[PDB]
């Protein structure tokens, strides 16, 4: 898709945005791509994961939710409306988007539009509160009520699809078409007014059901099952692991760049036996004042070598001035960048890019001359 390596290499705007956002990449990008002539595609080929990270930092979006339900007031009441919040109103309610499009660049502005919408009956009906006639609403926004009902019918048009017979409740009630039993009592029908018309309680149920169906259907985009779903997984066989087993041969070859006899071994052993029995004179461990001197010389030379090695071991301070310090640091940085690109093109093993290999070798020779 758009996350592939060639798309990230050709995406000039995304590279430029990541380059503006990052600061330490100035000191690598500035003298290599521009001053030293390295191709930007070659520069970003090694930093494809950084490009992919900056791509996925902004490409992902928050999932749909009932943003008008999260919005509640807190005399003066105040509410907070962020851009991601108002955009959430924009996808979850396209009627508000249609209200935005023909109004905010033509007649009147964003904050007074949102004040009119939040004071209108359309906000209450989209939130799911029961609409009653004594509220003023708003005259500009309340003309969109019929359009919102039209959009509700249109939403029901592509939401309505035949379902499986496992959950086909319409088939469940039409299994007997000529059943004519007792009509159930008033607790089983939707509530009615004094005149017998609907009280609108079923309308908010329809609205929240349609809202959930819209949220689930928004997940379904480009971004025999009855047997499996009625099968009892507990009564089947337990899962058998198919992990591979390894047997290691320890017959490794020996490392490559005077056998004593048992008789003389027993003689040496018996010598040790009698030398242990007769006397173990521990005072014999004391050296004879010359081998001890040689031993101490060897040990102190080893100590001197190790102390000179590990006397000294955030970067450490340098005797250079700071200007020459970052001059040498940026020259070493472009040294390492050119070396990395040369080694990748050298070990790629393709004859079609040997010209690029030769160009990078000439860059390395110029780099040697610059050093």
């Amino acid at each position: 898709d758009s996350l592939s390596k060639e798309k990230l290499l050709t995406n000039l705007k995304l590279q430029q945005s990541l380059l503006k956002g990052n600061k330490v990449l100035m000191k690598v990008f500035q003298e290599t791509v521009i001053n030293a002539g390295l191709p930007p595609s070659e520069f970003w080929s090694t930093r494809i994961p950084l490009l992919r990270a900056f791509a996925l930092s902004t490409s992902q979006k928050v999932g749909p939710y009932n943003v008008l339900s999260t919005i509640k007031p807190v005399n003066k009441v105040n509410v907070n409306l962020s851009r991601e919040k108002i955009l959430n109103i924009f996808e979850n309610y396209p009627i508000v988007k249609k209200a935005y499009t023909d109004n905010v660049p033509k007649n009147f502005k964003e904050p007074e539009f949102w004040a009119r919408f939040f004071s209108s009956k359309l906000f209450r009906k989209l939130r799911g509160e029961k609409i009653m006639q004594n509220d003023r609403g708003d005259v500009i926004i309340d003309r969109y009520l019929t359009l919102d009902q039209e959009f509700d019918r249109k939403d029901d048009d592509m939401l309505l699809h035949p379902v499986k017979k496992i959950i086909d409740l319409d088939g469940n009630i039409q299994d007997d078409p000529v059943v004519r039993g007792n009509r159930p009592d008033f607790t089983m029908q939707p509530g009615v007014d004094i005149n017998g018309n609907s009280d609108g309680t079923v309308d908010i149920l329809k609205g929240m059901n349609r809202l959930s169906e819209k949220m689930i259907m928004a997940l379904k985009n480009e971004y025999n099952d009855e047997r499996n779903e009625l099968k009892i997984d507990d009564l089947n066989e337990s899962y058998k692991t198919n992990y591979a087993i390894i047997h290691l041969k320890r017959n490794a070859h020996e490392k490559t760049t005077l056998k004593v006899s048992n008789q003389q071994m027993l003689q040496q052993l018996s010598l040790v036996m009698d030398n242990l029995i007769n006397k173990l004179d521990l005072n014999q461990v004391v050296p004879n004042n010359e081998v001890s001197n040689k031993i101490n010389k060897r040990v102190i030379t080893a100590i001197k070598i190790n102390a000179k090695q590990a006397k000294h071991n955030l970067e450490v301070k340098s005797t250079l001035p700071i200007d020459l310090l970052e001059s040498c640091r940026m020259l070493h940085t472009t040294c390492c960048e050119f070396l990395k690109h040369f080694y990748i093109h050298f070990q790629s093993g393709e004859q079609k890019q040997a010209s690029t290999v030769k160009k990078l070798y000439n860059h390395l020779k110029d780099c040697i001359e610059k050093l």
């Binding site: 000039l12 430029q16 380059l19 100035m26 500035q30 521009i34």
Partner: peptide
């Protein structure tokens, strides 16, 4: 400086756009 190196980025983007053009 940030202003001048963003100017260098703008000049390089203009050069690239000329390269496709």
């Amino acid at each position: 400086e940030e202003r001048e190196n963003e100017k260098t980025l703008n000049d390089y983007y203009a050069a690239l756009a000329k390269k496709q053009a």
